[PDB]
């Protein structure tokens, strides 16, 4: 019944060699609709990197590691993740949360040029990564919100001045975005919300793997589906056999616990 | 004579940069990106014994390709500087390949200028345009970027996914419209439409299935 | 934070976290926590040209004033609106004192005074609105704070400039920041007529709120039909459907809580009901 | 009670300005313009014995209508002056009808201001919007003009051609798309869709055939 | 076989009472594709007004006060002068305003939209000022201004030129090219909306529309002329006057035109 | 005006008005006047990526130079282009002297001199282009004037700013003004690749010209087919269709002259033909 989460052909979720190879940069792109939110996937990834496996999903002793996670959100405050991760017993010294909800508009936006806004955000990331450069994952939730919060910001400026530099500084970057804009009935996201839609397309193109959560189109037994798919870019890896193991899982999330299983 | 005897051999000559094409335009989409085709270029252009220096221009590539001789990060610097830099890596002297990862990042009204400053008898430019990334008044009749790019190109290679599963083309279309990305895309085996624009001005079209694993190309419709 | 026995606060039966009433018992039940948990917001959307949502907004504010006036239940109400008559329209009364049954035909006696309710004009710059909201929150430091935004984006009241994403979405993001920053004391209720809201803006707005409830008034045919069926029992005629799109806490942690056409609402002579459809 | 007993009588009450509607919005097109419906307004609002002064605002009407008490040429003067002038012709005192020949000429972002400065307990505004005249950034989410107008209106009357010949609706559609204007349009007999927005907030819809010759209205 | 041109129920083409009624203003809107050009219709109208009937379509020396003002944004003065001479229209009964010759060069170097329109209008006003109540005005392809003048909207063109012009005329005849509506695979409505608005608004203001079109379905026939009500009432004391809608086929060749029925 | 015996001018068989050759006898015939009547322009449009139209532009200019060099036939050629090599490419020769059979494989001897042909750069402001055209027309006051615009709006040569309607359509209107102002001495030839021209701009451009001819090269299939059919007779293979959209004088007075797929063109080894089209 219950399945383990597997992303890659070596049976791993977050390959340790993604952090030992060097000059390598890999982007995971996770998309979800707003009725199938990703908190449990975010936690599981942090769990994987820090504790060593996605135990909340697959199934343990005190352990110690250098492995570190930088967590950023444009829609959730710091307490949200701090509480979530405490409940999973992730050691607070193995992660850092960057809050781009709290006071963000009143500080970082109001009366301030686009370029300076983006440069300041990036600087917060750089400071965070600077400590543990090669054993750190970076997770960033809803950066596309900047396209709405910042007057006249184009997708290409967001990528050129923030996303791409960020990725160039990371072993592994995980972008988490809300795909509601593609799911309005009678409305063509391509034509009319092109600035916003470009972000999802370009993110996909740069990623080596795409995880997407959606409600089913066709039970109380099931929250939705998780698809695991190749992204548009090759995996940056010495291991020439490493590939994405594409998959579809159904999952049920309830009472703060999640179970993956097959159709 | 009016159409190719062996289109596969033509294809290979273009891939190997033997046949001259100063601007080769690759069209791709999220269902099948261009980097595998680019790999076919470098492969064929070494497997007929060539050894071209390759200048790689990156708007969206953070991992430096192994085949490249020079690498330029275009994301921080402006248009004039970028052109300067590209030229500074170019030259009789020898044959260079200039690869641009995405033409979507260059403003439409700069396209012709870009192509004209870079152009040279020693330069072949290979450039990718993503068909599904939208460009960034009412009596402005300048052609859209794709229309213009196709007009300026000497060779066009239009890349499409080849579907193996149980979803047909239109089903995958609607799924992709909802960003419900299906399995079965971005494969080693994919489809290619070649438009070769001859010296005579005539544009000839051929379809190929390409296996980027074995480097075997076969003909289609 | 609050007094530990603040009459307006009880544990959510689902998560035990501090929760407060919307002023409507049926809405409280619908939200899944016997109320709206503190540190969260609710958006009530309405289809068509009717404004049933105005009742809900009024209950949300009235409930606060009644708490403030009771034991203790110190509460301050913040209304983002040009319509100052809103305060004169709040209904009177028909975990004791957690929730009251209000009578929409009646009025608070006396009407809210200046220390109980504060108006903020939505025609001001976003930075100013956010500044004034926070200062009012801080000035009333040991009080439960109810922020109410009746008819968000009504074009008679919100100028065109406010419809720019960076303006309205900036505003909501800044307000969301406050609701989360003062999670011990603050809740937010907003209502909106969605028929004239462009789809992309509607998706962004929903994204700013912790819960979303959609009111669908019965169309012309259905209304006629009901009026026929209950010719002899007019008190049984219902007025539309209530759709649940998003629920506080549950949705954010990953549950699929969308539920359409399972509840119906009825505007009684004095009382607003939501029952199985 | 929830829908009109006699919709024709409701229609007549709206036409006669007995029933109160401070903003009545008429929608028309090249296949059937609004001026005949306007004529029905003045007719009914005199045939029940009314005698309202009528202020006529003209962006595109050069021939002064015979029924009008005041005429304003809006084509040369700016927005502020126009509002000033309209008001200067308005007031308890008596009931005035304010007719605007075309709302297409007022910029979308000024619509709500226009309706709010002119509004009054003694003013009923009757205004035409041409559905086939197109309005004159990417994170601008303000409603389009038609959407907004329909939202602000207390009554909507949407006018359509009634076809008598051998061309069906879609054929006439493609012809009009090529500007090959066919015979049989702009007739004395035409179709009307009424949306009456009640005090309760409910919007009720009814279809009528209207004969502007005999002033007989029937239901569809 | 051969038919006379008839526009109105009193059997007329250009009712003399359109020039005797006063404070009355009437607009004819003529549209044509570029393969079915309107020169012969323009001439016939001038003929009707000046000589008294459309003789070229349907004679002694005569004299009249009746006058025609002819303007074009696409044809030079010689074009109409030659055309009308061939029809023996007395040169003292018409005036041609040329907005092709030197038009662009007299209107660049940063001449503002408002001044451009005001100058055009002033030329019309000066022309009409002489014979105010016995004059027809014919204006060919004024929509070209929407292309020639940077940032000119349909509403400005109407507000600052067309509508004031019409307000000064007993009878105004606008002649426009409808090619923009006839591109295969292309929606004029969505993409050329500024231009398309001119045709719709002109129609709305007109009391009659004449349409010239190639057939969609012979060497026997050039095209069809449709006569249709416009969107506005006829301004007339005669309460019985109405447009007699009609379809004519016509053949134009060797500088002669014949109307006939299908 | 012109010398009354200018070798380049004859009466149109249709209207008797003064008419001059395009340099192509078959095109002259197609236009309906045994040439292009003076005071008129012709637009040659081409579909696809081929440039057969370049031949026509070259003939139009070469004809003029041959007249100038002949009796009298004083002619000055005005070329609106950046491509100064156009002048070095004009063909040599294979109502006497009205029209000549040119040989595209050969070249004028000697090449055009500065007093015979003038270049004007299309990258200049519209007002300047119009000023220079008129001054050249006036300076050459008793000469037949041939204005040639090869590859109008080619994006390699025309900057984006020129694509604004007020710019390009202003230009053409101003040029039309000149052709009509000096109707006794001036003709205009322009060619354009229409595939990248947006529809509305194309309709406006057609509206500025007195005649419009559209060249449609045979697609891949059709070309293969012909190459099969005339395997043994390669000299018979034709290269595309010629569509007539608008003709000088006839169209403006009200005639429906549109004629599609009735003519075909063939690029010979030396000679450009347009003959009746019949699917072989």
UniProtKB/Swiss-Prot annotation, chain A:
Pathway: tRNA modification; 5-methoxycarbonylmethyl-2-thiouridine-tRNA biosynthesis. GO terms for molecular function: identical protein binding. GO terms for cellular component: cytoplasm; elongator holoenzyme complex; nucleoplasm. One of its GO terms (biological process) is regulation of translation. It is found in: Cytoplasm; Nucleus. Keywords: Cytoplasm, Nucleus, tRNA processing. Component of the elongator complex which consists of ELP1/IKI3, ELP2, ELP3, ELP4, ELP5/IKI1 and ELP6. The elongator complex is composed of two copies of the Elp123 subcomplex (composed of ELP1/IKI3, ELP2 and ELP3) and two copies of the Elp456 subcomplex (composed of ELP4, ELP5/IKI1 and ELP6). The Elp123 subcomplex forms a two-lobed scaffold, which binds the Elp456 subcomplex asymmetrically. In each lobe, ELP2 is tightly sandwiched between ELP1/IKI3 and ELP3. The Elp123 subcomplex binds tRNA through ELP1/IKI3 and ELP3 and can bind 2 tRNAs simultaneously. This is Elongator complex protein 6.
Swiss-Prot record, chain B:
One of its GO terms (cellular component) is elongator holoenzyme complex. The keyword Iron does not apply. The modification Phosphoserine is found at residues 2-3. Component of the elongator complex which is required for multiple tRNA modifications, including mcm5U (5-methoxycarbonylmethyl uridine), mcm5s2U (5-methoxycarbonylmethyl-2-thiouridine), and ncm5U (5-carbamoylmethyl uridine). The elongator complex catalyzes formation of carboxymethyluridine in the wobble base at position 34 in tRNAs. It functions as a gamma-toxin target (TOT); disruption of the complex confers resistance to Kluyveromyces lactis toxin zymocin (pGKL1 killer toxin). May also be involved in sensitivity to Pichia inositovora toxin. One of its GO terms (molecular function) is identical protein binding. It comes from Saccharomyces cerevisiae (strain ATCC 204508 / S288c) (Baker's yeast). Its main location: cytoplasm. Keywords: Cytoplasm, Nucleus, Phosphoprotein, tRNA processing. The keyword Heme does not apply. This is Elongator complex protein 5. GO terms for biological process: regulation of translation; tRNA modification; tRNA wobble uridine modification.
Curated annotation (Swiss-Prot), chain E:
GO terms for biological process: protein urmylation; regulation of transcription by RNA polymerase II; regulation of translation; tRNA wobble uridine modification. The keyword Glycoprotein does not apply. InterPro entries: ELP6, P-loop_NTPase. One of its GO terms (molecular function) is identical protein binding. It is found in: Cytoplasm; Nucleus. It comes from the Eukaryota. Pathway: tRNA modification; 5-methoxycarbonylmethyl-2-thiouridine-tRNA biosynthesis. Keywords: Cytoplasm, Nucleus, tRNA processing. GO terms for cellular component: cytoplasm; elongator holoenzyme complex; nucleoplasm. Gene3D superfamilies: P-loop containing nucleotide triphosphate hydrolases. Component of the elongator complex which is required for multiple tRNA modifications, including mcm5U (5-methoxycarbonylmethyl uridine), mcm5s2U (5-methoxycarbonylmethyl-2-thiouridine), and ncm5U (5-carbamoylmethyl uridine). The elongator complex catalyzes formation of carboxymethyluridine in the wobble base at position 34 in tRNAs. It functions as a gamma-toxin target (TOT); disruption of the complex confers resistance to Kluyveromyces lactis toxin zymocin (pGKL1 killer toxin). May also be involved in sensitivity to Pichia inositovora toxin. Belongs to the ELP6 family. This is Elongator complex protein 6. It comes from Saccharomyces cerevisiae (strain ATCC 204508 / S288c) (Baker's yeast).
UniProtKB/Swiss-Prot annotation, chain F:
Residues 11-24 have a biased composition (Low complexity). GO terms for cellular component: cytoplasm; elongator holoenzyme complex; nucleoplasm; transcription elongation factor complex. Pathway: tRNA modification; 5-methoxycarbonylmethyl-2-thiouridine-tRNA biosynthesis. One of its GO terms (molecular function) is identical protein binding. The keyword Repeat does not apply. GO terms for biological process: regulation of transcription by RNA polymerase II; regulation of translation; tRNA wobble uridine modification. Keywords: Cytoplasm, Methylation, Nucleus, Phosphoprotein, tRNA processing. It is found in: Cytoplasm; Nucleus. Disulfide bonds: none annotated. Belongs to the ELP4 family. Present with 358 molecules/cell in log phase SD medium. Component of the elongator complex, a multiprotein complex which is required for multiple tRNA modifications, including mcm5U (5-methoxycarbonylmethyl uridine), mcm5s2U (5-methoxycarbonylmethyl-2-thiouridine), and ncm5U (5-carbamoylmethyl uridine). The elongator complex catalyzes formation of carboxymethyluridine in the wobble base at position 34 in tRNAs. It functions as a gamma-toxin target (TOT); disruption of the complex confers resistance to Kluyveromyces lactis toxin zymocin (pGKL1 killer toxin). May also be involved in sensitivity to Pichia inositovora toxin. This is Elongator complex protein 4. It comes from Saccharomyces cerevisiae (strain ATCC 204508 / S288c) (Baker's yeast).
